Design a protein around this ligand. Structure first.
Ligand SMILES: *P(=O)(O)OCC(C)(C)[C@@H](O)C(=O)NCCC(=O)NCCS
Lengths: 75, 436
């Protein structure tokens, strides 16, 4: 499933760095925890989010574990 | 705005006094002065002190560059040039600048093992005479060499008030980059973390969402004490398979809650757990060096009629009881108890669970050099019991650490076994009902 918004793209790049998985393998329907993330990865993702101008916290990643859903609630 | 959190009127006079008693170097300056956090203090009171040891072998090793790297590392991270002291019974931190780092150096006899020399210094004087609250800098370097300088041990000593699991790897990767002359991004320091916490607090404490959250979260709760030389007890199990949507940490905490439920006679349990303290919107919060850890209450409430609760129900509940607190986990525990409960502010946590989902192995890729890691460690609990869980590739290791007067060997062994057994049972059958 293809990345469709700018937020989805920026978020995928963040997941790629934090999970050390290649960007090409990330689809919009991917689940952060199923791809191997845990609470500490989520903390790092959230911080990298801020540096890219997105805004979400660790709780948002637990509530919206799927990439496309997380990209909507980021501000 | 440096010194804006100082609890002392003339911070510069304190520094001058310490210089004149030869506790800190006379050519240092005072860059800042702040209160020490409760978590920093937990570690300092328990003598928590480490020596991170790097055995380096090869012909290309450059001793001058090692020395200079120690100096540069301290210039970069202000927690590493922080001194701790008490004022009116309360611990503060002095952040020094213009600090010259002096490496303790040993040139061994032929045939002498450098590591045995480090061990001898460690046990003979380095930890037995440790007095962090006397104000002497806890961060110090030692370099022990065989003749020829092709086999060297480098040592960094440090108080646990100065690092945590998220950030310690950055100390080693920064060291390597500076040695290798690789470029480094700018970073923040621990002081910036303390200023950021205070700026997000509200001046009226009854209007702070955080203390409102804790008040509701802990309403009607009671914190029981499950248990009345320092001992470590270990127990390995096969790595658990994780039910969909559940983290390993949740599994460990649910197991602990079930255990306590039975051990006490209670459906409503509160115990402590370790959180990373880095879920805050501040620049470089993921990488800054310091101890941002916090030990906070976790509450798990079984229904009065749990007949139908499954393991999954317990897992989802336990996980939600952690995530509800994510935005509020960063405040001092004594402030939680003072502003959000009837409990005495200095009420201690008696059981603390730490899940170690951080780096467990370390590297120092110096440029051909063979570099091995090892460490020495002191940690002595007071009346509390600690349960650590380490997730390795081949096993999940459950570790119990407590004083023997609180938990004797047989009791500790049984605790480790029970928590392990419950974790495995949860893993192999998550759809089961709690009447196992
Ligand atoms: P998540 O559900 O995967 O993790 C929860 C945690 C609360 C276990 C994790 O977020 C965490 O804060 N800390 C564990 C790391 C830690 O601080 N280790 C000890 C430092 S020396």
């Amino acid at each position: 499933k293809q990345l469709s918004t700018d937020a989805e793209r920026e978020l995928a790049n963040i997941w790629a760095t934090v999970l050390d998985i290649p960007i090409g393998t990330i689809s919009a329907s991917d689940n952060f925890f199923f791809r191997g993330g845990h609470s500490i990865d989520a903390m790092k993702a959230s911080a990298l989010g801020r540096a890219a101008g997105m805004s979400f916290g660790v709780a948002d990643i637990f509530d919206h574990p799927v990439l496309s859903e997380l990209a909507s609630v980021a501000v | 705005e440096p010194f804006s959190l100082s609890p002392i009127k003339d911070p510069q006079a304190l520094h001058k006094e310490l210089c004149s008693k030869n506790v800190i170097p006379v050519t240092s300056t005072l860059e800042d002065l702040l209160p020490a956090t409760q978590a920093q203090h937990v570690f300092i009171k328990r003598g928590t002190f480490h020596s991170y040891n790097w055995t380096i072998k090869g012909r290309s090793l450059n001793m001058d560059r090692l020395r200079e790297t120690c100096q540069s590392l301290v210039d970069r991270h202000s927690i590493l040039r922080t001194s701790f002291v008490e004022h009116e019974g309360h611990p503060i931190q002095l952040v020094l600048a213009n600090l010259d780092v002096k490496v303790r150096e040993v040139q061994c006899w032929p045939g002498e093992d450098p590591m045995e020399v480090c061990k001898a210094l460690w046990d003979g004087k380095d930890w037995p005479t440790l007095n962090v609250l006397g104000g002497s800098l806890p961060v110090r370097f030692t370099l022990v060499s065989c003749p020829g300088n092709e086999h060297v041990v480098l040592t960094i000593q440090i108080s646990h008030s100065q690092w945590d699991g998220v950030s310690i790897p950055k100390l080693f990767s920064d060291f390597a980059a500076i040695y290798n002359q690789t470029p480094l991004p700018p970073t923040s320091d621990f002081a910036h973390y303390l200023y950021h916490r205070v700026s997000s607090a509200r001046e009226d404490v009854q209007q702070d969402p955080t203390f409102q959250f804790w008040r509701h979260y802990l309403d009607g709760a009671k914190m029981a004490v499950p248990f009345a030389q320092t001992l470590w007890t270990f127990k390995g199990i096969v790595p658990p398979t994780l039910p969909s949507g559940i983290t390993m940490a949740t599994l460990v905490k649910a197991a602990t809650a079930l255990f306590l439920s039975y051990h006490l006679g209670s459906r409503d349990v509160v115990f402590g757990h370790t959180v990373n303290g880095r879920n805050l919107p501040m620049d470089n919060i993921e990488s800054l060096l310091g101890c941002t850890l916090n030990f906070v209450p976790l509450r798990v409430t079984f229904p009065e009629d749990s007949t139908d609760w499954t393991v999954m129900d317990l897992l989802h509940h336990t996980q939600t009881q952690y995530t509800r607190a994510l935005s509020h986990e960063h405040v001092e525990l004594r402030d939680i108890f003072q502003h959000s409960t009837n409990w005495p502010a200095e009420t201690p946590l008696s059981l603390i669970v730490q899940h170690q989902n951080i780096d467990l192995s370390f590297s120092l890729p110096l440029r051909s050099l063979d570099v091995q890691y090892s460490k020495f460690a002191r940690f002595d609990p007071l009346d509390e019991v600690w349960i650590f869980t380490e997730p390795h590739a081949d096993r999940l290791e459950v570790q119990v650490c407590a004083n023997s007067r609180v938990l004797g060997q047989e009791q500790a062994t049984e605790l480790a076994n029970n928590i392990s057994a419950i974790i495995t049972k949860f893993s192999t059958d998550p759809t089961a009902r709690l009447l196992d």
